[PDB]
Design a protein around this ligand. Structure first.
Ligand SMILES: CC1=C(/C=C/C(C)=C\C=C\C(C)=C\C(=O)O)C(C)(C)CCC1
Ligand SMILES: CC1=C(/C=C/C(C)=C\C=C\C(C)=C\C(=O)O)C(C)(C)CCC1
Lengths: 214, 11, 214, 11
C-alpha cells in the first residue's frame, strides 16, 4: 500500500538532469553518493532499519548504476554517457581490454531499452525493484523487503497498460531485462575485483568500500 | 564497518 | 501465435514422472539427455535452425536443470531430490565444501517455489522462457527467439489470473525468480569449471561437452 | 564441435 510511480519518477528526476576504465570507475564512485540520495527518495526505504538499508545498497549498487547509465545512453550511438559528462566509445572500451563486457551492456541493455523506448518511470521502478532485493543476505526482515518489491511491480504494471494499453506484454518485457542486468552486474564486479588486485586503475574511496567484504 | 555508506544514510 | 501452456505442461510431464558433488554431477549428465527431449517437445523449438537449437541449449542448460530439480524438491525438507532417486541433504552439501551455493538454491529457489506453490505449468513456462533466450550469442535470428519468448510469457500470464485470479501479482512473482536463477546458475558453472580443473569429481561426457568452449 | 548435442537434436 502506497508506492506511487510519481514518487519513483521524482527520485529519478531529482538525481539526474585516458584509460576508459579509470574514467568509468571515477564516474561510478561519484554516482555512488548520488545513489544514496536516490534511495532515500524511494518510498519507505528510509523507514527500513539502517543495517538493512546498507545491505540493500551494497547488494544492488552495481546493477543500479549500470541500469542508470545504460538508460542515459539510449541516445548515444555506439557507447555510453558517463555522469561526468564523458563518453566512452565501444572502440575505446575494446582498445582497453574490456570490449566483451562493454558490448554486453550495449547489446543486452542499452539497445533493448532504446528498442522499446523505456521511459524514466519504468526505469525508476525497475531500479526500485532491484533495490528492494528480498534475497539479500543478512536482511533482518526479508518479508518486509519482499512486500515493498511487490508494491513496486504492482504500481509499475498499472502504469504500463494505462500508458501503453497497446502493448500488453510491456510489463513482462521490462522485468525480463533483469536477468541480463544481474549477469552483467556480476561480470562487472569480477572485472573490478581484478583491477583492484592488479593495482592499476585508481579506485576511489566509496567504490573501494563497496568492494570490501562481505 | 562500511563507514561512508552508514554516514551518508544517517544524515 | 500458438504457444499453449497445455503443450508446455505435457513436455514437463513427459520427461519426469559418497561425494554429493559426484552424485549431483552424475544426475546432471543423465538429465542433459532428457533436457534435449524436453526442448523438442516445446512448441516451435525444433523448427529453429539446428545451430540455434544448440546455442539455446548450451546457453541455458544449467538454469534449466536447476529449475527442474528445485521444483522437484519442494516436498523435500532441507535438501534436494536428484533425478537418480538420490537425496542430497543440506548438511551433506555443507560437509563437501559446497554449502554456500547449496543454501542459495534452497533459500532463493526451492523455498520460494514452495511458498507460492508454483505448479508444473508455471515451471514449464518459466523454463520455456529461459530456453528461448534472445540474448544468446551467435543466434542467427534473435528476433525469432525473442518472439517465441513473448508468446510464452503471454500464455503464462493468461494461465495465471485465470487459474489464480485472487493473486494479481503472481505472474510478476514468477518472472522475478529468474534473476536469482541466473545468478545461481552462473555460480554453479564456476564450481563446475573448478571441479574439472582440480581433477577430482568424475565428469561424464555430456556434462563435459557442455563445459567445452565457447 | 559439440558432437553429442547435435546428434541428439537431429535424431
Ligand atoms: C561499465 C564498466 C565496468 C563497470 C562499471 C561500473 C561497475 C559502474 C559504472 C557506473 C557508471 C558509469 C555510472 C555513471 O556514469 O552514471 C566494468 C568493470 C565492466 C569495466 C567496463 C566498463
Ligand atoms: C546443484 C549443485 C551444483 C551444480 C548442479 C548442476 C550444474 C546441475 C544439477 C542437475 C541436477 C541435480 C539434475 C537433476 O537431478 O534433475 C554445484 C556445481 C553448484 C555444486 C553444488 C550442487
Amino acid at each position: 500500500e502506497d508506492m506511487p510511480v510519481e514518487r519513483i519518477l521524482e527520485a529519478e528526476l531529482a538525481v539526474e538532469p585516458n584509460d576508459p576504465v579509470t574514467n568509468i570507475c571515477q564516474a561510478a564512485d561519484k554516482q555512488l553518493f548520488t545513489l544514496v540520495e536516490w534511495a532515500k527518495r524511494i518510498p519507505h526505504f528510509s523507514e527500513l532499519p539502517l543495517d538493512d538499508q546498507v545491505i540493500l545498497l551494497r547488494a544492488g549498487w552495481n546493477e543500479l548504476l549500470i541500469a542508470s547509465f545504460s538508460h542515459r545512453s539510449i541516445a548515444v550511438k555506439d557507447g555510453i554517457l558517463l555522469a561526468t559528462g564523458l563518453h566512452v566509445h565501444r572502440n575505446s572500451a575494446h582498445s582497453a581490454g574490456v570490449g566483451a563486457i562493454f558490448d554486453r551492456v550495449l547489446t543486452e541493455l542499452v539497445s533493448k531499452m532504446r528498442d522499446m523506448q523505456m521511459d524514466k518511470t519504468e526505469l525508476g521502478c525497475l531500479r526500485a525493484i532491484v533495490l528492494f532485493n528480498p534475497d539479500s543476505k543478512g536482511l533482518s526482515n526479508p518479508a518486509e523487503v519482499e512486500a515493498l518489491r511487490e508494491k513496486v511491480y504492482a504500481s509499475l504494471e498499472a502504469y504500463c497498460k494505462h500508458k501503453y494499453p497497446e502493448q500488453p506484454g510491456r510489463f513482462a518485457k521490462l522485468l525480463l531485462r533483469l536477468p541480463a542486468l544481474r549477469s552483467i552486474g556480476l561480470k562487472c564486479l569480477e572485472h573490478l575485483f581484478f583491477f583492484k588486485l592488479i593495482g592499476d586503475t585508481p579506485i576511489d574511496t566509496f567504490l573501494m568500500e563497496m568492494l570490501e567484504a562481505p | 564497518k562500511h563507514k561512508i555508506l552508514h554516514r551518508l544514510l544517517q544524515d
